[PDB]
Design an enzyme around this catalytic site. Structure first.
Site, PDB file in Angstrom:
ATOM      1  N   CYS A 112     -11.354   6.207   8.248  1.00 18.11           N
ATOM      2  CA  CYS A 112     -11.071   5.227   7.871  1.00 18.11           C
ATOM      3  C   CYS A 112     -11.280   4.462   8.637  1.00 18.11           C
ATOM      4  O   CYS A 112     -11.955   3.720   9.390  1.00 18.11           O
ATOM      5  CB  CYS A 112     -10.811   5.206   6.328  1.00 18.11           C
ATOM      6  SG  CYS A 112      -9.429   4.619   5.865  1.00 18.11           S
ATOM      7  N   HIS A 168      -3.075  -0.563   6.191  1.00 20.61           N
ATOM      8  CA  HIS A 168      -3.249  -0.144   5.174  1.00 20.61           C
ATOM      9  C   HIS A 168      -2.706   0.648   4.245  1.00 20.61           C
ATOM     10  O   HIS A 168      -1.120  -0.462   4.207  1.00 20.61           O
ATOM     11  CB  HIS A 168      -2.662   1.761   6.570  1.00 20.61           C
ATOM     12  CG  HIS A 168      -3.264   3.079   6.277  1.00 20.61           C
ATOM     13  ND1 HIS A 168      -4.370   2.706   6.712  1.00 20.61           N
ATOM     14  CD2 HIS A 168      -3.903   4.109   4.758  1.00 20.61           C
ATOM     15  CE1 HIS A 168      -5.757   4.112   6.211  1.00 20.61           C
ATOM     16  NE2 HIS A 168      -4.898   4.643   4.966  1.00 20.61           N
TER      17      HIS A 168
END
Ligand SMILES: NC(=O)c1ccc[n+]([C@@H]2O[C@H](COP(=O)([O-])OP(=O)(O)OC[C@H]3O[C@@H](n4cnc5c(N)ncnc54)[C@H](O)[C@@H]3O)[C@@H](O)[C@H]2O)c1
Ligand SMILES: NC(=O)c1ccc[n+]([C@@H]2O[C@H](COP(=O)([O-])OP(=O)(O)OC[C@H]3O[C@@H](n4cnc5c(N)ncnc54)[C@H](O)[C@@H]3O)[C@@H](O)[C@H]2O)c1
Ligand SMILES: NC(=O)c1ccc[n+]([C@@H]2O[C@H](COP(=O)([O-])OP(=O)(O)OC[C@H]3O[C@@H](n4cnc5c(N)ncnc54)[C@H](O)[C@@H]3O)[C@@H](O)[C@H]2O)c1
Ligand SMILES: NC(=O)c1ccc[n+]([C@@H]2O[C@H](COP(=O)([O-])OP(=O)(O)OC[C@H]3O[C@@H](n4cnc5c(N)ncnc54)[C@H](O)[C@@H]3O)[C@@H](O)[C@H]2O)c1
Lengths: 337, 339, 339, 337
Positions: free
Chosen positions: B155, B182
């Site tokens: 992603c 993240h």
């Protein structure tokens, strides 16, 4: 002094050795450690706690297979099988199961096959396995007790003083629960595990579960058979936990008296094992605390002079580690050989 | 309308199946699941999400090898062995690597030998032998029988690739080095534990983690004109589950505003990258994007310019939810590319 | 050895007093505290820290207007009124703004009118009338009777200023735009609550927050050769406290490595910026720097180069602990600059 | 239909209006809101929950002083004084104290002075203040009850079914505690507050405290005077909480029976008020759940057939908000005027 060995180097053994080096005249001596991790990896790891912080002592990998502790070198090994481990090689007097997998007699037996003298366990011995606790059965420890365990820190916290409480007024019965903090026993994210609760992420979730404490207390106190059956609440903290419990005692009384007796015990024998806290204090206010138990006398209450709510905290590992320390010392006691 | 089987029921696969059943006319048929975790647990797991919660429809357990969802039954396998999966028996067209294990081509081809027609990698291929296809990027450039085992990187990558491409396309980007935020994942350690990378080896919930991402390469992979143009390191927040990145780049233009770009941003996001790309305007924070199908959502009040060409950009994404949708529509395209 | 009084017992002031009593030969005398919170509570508060914990020495409560620490007694006031503080009575040389309230010069001068000799602002002055003095930066450039009310902007700023200065000094930085990872603070909202900035108004513990920092100006303030040279926005992580920043800049050099700089980094950090600056090498994460007196700690494995001159840098700091030490040694210098 | 007004627009009122718009045939009508915040600020705020997420309905500031709800405009006001608030102006039938500061009769009285008909309170009425609870005293609600309150969601969860339990076997007594999640009542960081515990950061720290529930149950059930005195454990989650309780019932029995009766009640009247959960489920598995209570029948246990441990969850606001909804509807009931 006595040659010791730790196995399954969880944060448990990490804090443990942190205390051991920090131990004043440690009559014991760990010489080797097993865990799947590697040498410099583990050295770095232990070098920095996420709760205490860094280690207040230089630890380098003295050798590619061992690490120093300010020069105190200790061999680092990595395997999943006790027979692959230098027990008879290093003449190991004692191995410390931290893997949690050798919850059987047999699991410990593997180390003895590789040449272990005695094996001690940080976990509730799954099955008929003795667990000694300071001020509890520690006197019942014999040198013949070569294979003995230690149940969850949670349990060990409860045992002694509730024993005295049954010895104080006489606990007819009463069950409990604990604000236990999560752990590796609970998957970081929602990952498959034997227990769905344990399988849950739980990083942001309270987990309802149980603990052998409900029986471990009946275990350590056969007198306490069935008088308590408490469950476990894995809370979304990483830290020291506190315990809830209401009991039914035979003699009627008021909380304050119980608190006073608590202090008294934390002077007579529960001294160093137990503290009585009266200030408004939370998990942070109990870290690196060596008393296994911190009675919140300020909040403990009794219903009907018999139904006794209680509050006392316990460090996930640090206190438990200290318990490991002094029990190991007791093993060094009665150690003619 | 085409046979599918998830290979490894990661949380990624959980969100994925959520989208699949939550898909309007999913041209694909996920019929059997792989995870060595027991079907009752699985049913529970998907049936009880954290980031969004219980499936917003029934899930039941037909015979405990094979549960169901809203009457629609789903087979399940539970193994770590590729060949031991009935790709051949179940006639599965496509493998959905939800373990990150076979970051190698051969690892995936194992399941093909077990009777699979194609494999997609829900992760960056550690090798390069596998086409890391991306929506709005090379998805059009995908061809059947053209390495029918294609890959799809994090992603993290996919969020960044397409619009920054359009940015160096309309404006031209000299270079730049990103950095994301993240959120912790299973590879991270809830508590300091035995683990390879020292960083994510630490207690995740209580540490921002300095790491990197294959993205800075994957972007150069998907954008060969970006070869060695982008770097950037992965910052792992003990946040529940919200992905977001920033990056300052030197534009190749005259040194234009960022504003104008935000206009062009939403334009393309409203243009060729409808649904794929968002450029929001509301000043929002992490939770303000939960379960958002946009591969990226820019907020104009953030992206800025330092030196005319030295220009900053901020946008968000859900490491699974969006990524899940990506898996969906790529497979659907694959299905179109399928005979 | 010189009278001091904290004006507002923020967590900042708590850590500050920790360092003060934890100071070897603190040339200053903090004698009375300001916070409208009750002395018993205060004693408790400082006596029970979260980020590090209980004072590692006794704290007692002499008469509940005036508690003690290890026998050493400390007065306390509790007010929001400046003039109502016995700066004149207690003869306090210096005001320690631990509320962020008087980001104005006049607000501070109020306490001077209440009998204070000097004021330091533990925060960025919203105006500019106040010298935002910084260690290793303008601390040397501080003069007595030279605006005896001087200011000191956020740790965020102070962490960045000196070494980036040395960077544009030895290597020359064209420009750059930073971005930190700030940890939530009282201004943030534990839960979504009525609050001015939409962002930090959200539930802090569950949201990364896009905000900005006066730093990008404060740095240009302290570095007029950095006027409009740096931008950068504040990212507020729901972590207790482990401040850390990144920034990519275009160097004015030939395009040298980052490695060489890391060498020069630690060199200056070991050179003129001993104790002030760190450049560590161990790959570490947030918790790996709790209670570290270094205004900044770089790890080399992080700082990198994109385009020769396009160069990245990573380092850490404790928004209070280090900042606290900064307050300490500046006041000590002030004490040296004091008659 | 009935003109309503909310005050002190905490997350409480936010979720509340989220339900109200989401309410199927809301017989009520909020028209204005007070809170220190501003119009677009609050609009944005409510537009995005940190737990449910965004609002599944466009809300813009319809006017600089009011906001639309898909066109449903509602006036937004901002003040710290009820007299400054358009009660007699807007002819307000009911004001909803969310500030938590008007815990007195007088506090509510200020709104009535500015022209309020009735005042309802999301908080335990500090002092002699009536609190009606669904299936509990809601029938005791009279139109003469113009000034009535509502105690903490925690309490309201406990009240009805424990009432039935005393009605089922007869609870001699028994105290409790709750896994209550933190809130604004506890300072985000360690900031000064009336309670040191509440003053604590607690973002990473379990907080021991209490709640009027210990008496609020005795309040709503004078029969339950002293039969329970439970405390509060503010847990480091932001979310829906669950409750612990062991009681002493007069009639002996086994947990499973109690669970069955629980289900039965959650059918007869506790239907919609209460659910019985049997699956391994955690806080996440109870969000936006309208039943005030989710009996973990799967884990509830009894000691000595009388000492009944119980597990049931309750949403910090959402469920509580629903309680507010239907009680307000009851106010619209018996509302001839
Ligand atoms: N959480 C606590 O502090 C706590 C308190 C009470 C009891 N315990 C006991 O401690 C143990 C868990 O320790 P922890 O909580 O630090 O978790 P942990 O997961 O960190 O400890 C297990 C460690 O041993 C390793 N390991 C697993 N199997 C192994 C094997 N066969 N051989 C070698 N190494 C192996 C794991 O990789 C890991 O590093 C259990 O026995 C548990 O009952 C833990
Ligand atoms: N986290 C993300 O959003 C994200 C994004 C990009 C890439 N990925 C890739 O996805 C992978 C999994 O995603 P995740 O974050 O949900 O991880 P995860 O660890 O939660 O998913 C793996 C699951 O499958 C199981 N498993 C492991 N190996 C297996 C095997 N060989 N066969 C079957 N089951 C197996 C694991 O026990 C676990 O239950 C990662 O390894 C990563 O490479 C994930
Ligand atoms: N958070 C940091 O590390 C950091 C770094 C740079 C700047 N600052 C500045 O420091 C200030 C306070 O630091 P903090 O983060 O500990 O905040 P804080 O809100 O915890 O500290 C303020 C404390 O003082 C009290 N107070 C408020 N106004 C007062 C007044 N006029 N007189 C007396 N007491 C008053 C508050 O109730 C609170 O107890 C911030 O407003 C900010 O401008 C802090
Ligand atoms: N945690 C919960 O959801 C919960 C549980 C049970 C009961 N309650 C009750 O809800 C209230 C707290 O709500 P919350 O938990 O959402 O917290 P909150 O702090 O978000 O609610 C208070 C709100 O009202 C505002 N406010 C304060 N004083 C005011 C005044 N005088 N005039 C106008 N606005 C004012 C505050 O700025 C804030 O926006 C208390 O009465 C509490 O007893 C809340």
């Amino acid at each position: 002094k006595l040659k010791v060995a730790i196995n399954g180097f969880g944060r448990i053994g990490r804090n443990f050795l942190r205390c051991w080096h920090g131990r004043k005249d440690s009559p014991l001596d760990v010489v080797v450690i097993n865990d799947t991790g590697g040498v410099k990896q583990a050295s770095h790891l232990l070098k920095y706690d996420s709760i205490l912080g860094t280690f207040d002592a230089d630890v380098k990998t003295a050798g590619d297979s061992a690490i120093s502790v300010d020069g105190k070198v200790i061999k680092v090994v990595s395997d999943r099988n006790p027979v692959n481990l230098p027990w008879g090689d290093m003449g190991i007097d004692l191995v410390i199961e931290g893997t949690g997998v050798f919850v059987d007699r047999d699991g410990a037996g593997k180390h003895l096959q590789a040449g272990a003298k005695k094996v001690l366990i940080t976990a509730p011995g799954k099955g008929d396995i003795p667990t000694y606790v300071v001020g509890v059965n520690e006197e019942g420890y014999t040198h013949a007790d070569t294979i003995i365990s230690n149940a969850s820190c949670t349990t060990n916290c409860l045992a002694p003083f509730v024993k005295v409480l049954d010895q104080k007024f006489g606990i007819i019965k009463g069950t409990m629960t604990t604000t236990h903090s999560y752990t590796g026993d609970q998957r970081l994210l929602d990952a498959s595990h034997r227990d769905l609760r344990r399988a849950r992420a739980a990083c942001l979730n309270i987990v309802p579960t149980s603990t052998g404490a409900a029986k471990a207390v009946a275990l350590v106190l056969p007198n306490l058979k069935g008088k308590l059956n408490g469950i476990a609440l894995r809370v979304p903290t990483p830290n020291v936990s506190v315990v809830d419990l209401v009991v039914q005692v035979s003699k009627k009384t008021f909380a304050e008296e119980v608190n006073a007796a608590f202090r008294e015990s934390a002077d007579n024998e529960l001294k160093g094992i137990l503290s009585v806290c009266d200030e408004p204090l939370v998990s942070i206010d109990f870290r690196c605390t060596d008393v296994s138990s911190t009675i919140d006398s300020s909040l403990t209450m009794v219903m009907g002079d018999d139904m006794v709510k209680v509050i006392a905290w316990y460090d996930n590992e640090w206190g438990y580690s200290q318990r490991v320390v002094d029990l190991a010392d007791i093993v060094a006691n009665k150690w003619q050989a | 309308k085409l046979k599918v089987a998830i290979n490894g029921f990661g949380r990624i696969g959980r969100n994925f199946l959520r989208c699949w059943h939550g898909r309007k006319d999913s041209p694909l048929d996920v019929v059997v699941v792989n995870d060595s975790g027991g079907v009752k647990s699985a049913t529970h797991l998907l049936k009880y999400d954290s980031i969004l919660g219980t499936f917003k429809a029934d899930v039941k357990i037909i015979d405990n090898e094979t549960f169901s969802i809203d009457g629609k039954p789903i087979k399940v396998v539970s193994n770590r062995d590729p060949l031991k999966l009935p790709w051949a028996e179940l006639g599965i067209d496509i493998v959905i690597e939800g373990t990150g294990v076979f970051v190698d081509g051969p690892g995936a081809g194992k399941h093909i030998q077990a009777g699979a027609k194609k494999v997609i990698i829900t992760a960056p291929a550690k090798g390069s032998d596998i086409p890391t296809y991306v929506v709005g990027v090379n998805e059009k450039d995908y061809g059947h029988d053209v390495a029918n085992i294609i890959s799809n990187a994090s992603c993290t990558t996919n969020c960044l690739a397409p619009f920054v491409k359009v940015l160096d396309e309309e404006l031209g980007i000299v270079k730049g080095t990103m950095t994301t935020t993240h959120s912790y994942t299973g590879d991270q350690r809830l508590l300091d534990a035995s683990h390879r990378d020292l960083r994510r080896a630490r207690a995740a919930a209580l540490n921002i983690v300095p790491t990197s991402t294959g993205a800075a390469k994957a972007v150069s992979l998907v954008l060969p004109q970006l070869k060695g143009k982008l770097n950037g390191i992965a910052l792992r927040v003990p946040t529940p589950n919200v992905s977001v990145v920033d990056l300052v780049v030197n534009i190749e233009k005259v040194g234009v505003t960022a504003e104008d770009v935000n206009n062009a941003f939403r334009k393309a996001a409203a243009g060729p990258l409808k649904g794929v790309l968002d450029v929001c305007d509301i000043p929002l924070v992490s939770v303000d994007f939960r379960c958002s199908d946009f591969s990226s959502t820019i907020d104009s009040s953030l992206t800025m310019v330092m030196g005319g060409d030295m220009v900053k950009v901020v946008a968000w994404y859900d490491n699974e939810w969006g990524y899940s949708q990506r898996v969906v529509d790529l497979a659907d395209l694959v299905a179109n590319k399928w005979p």
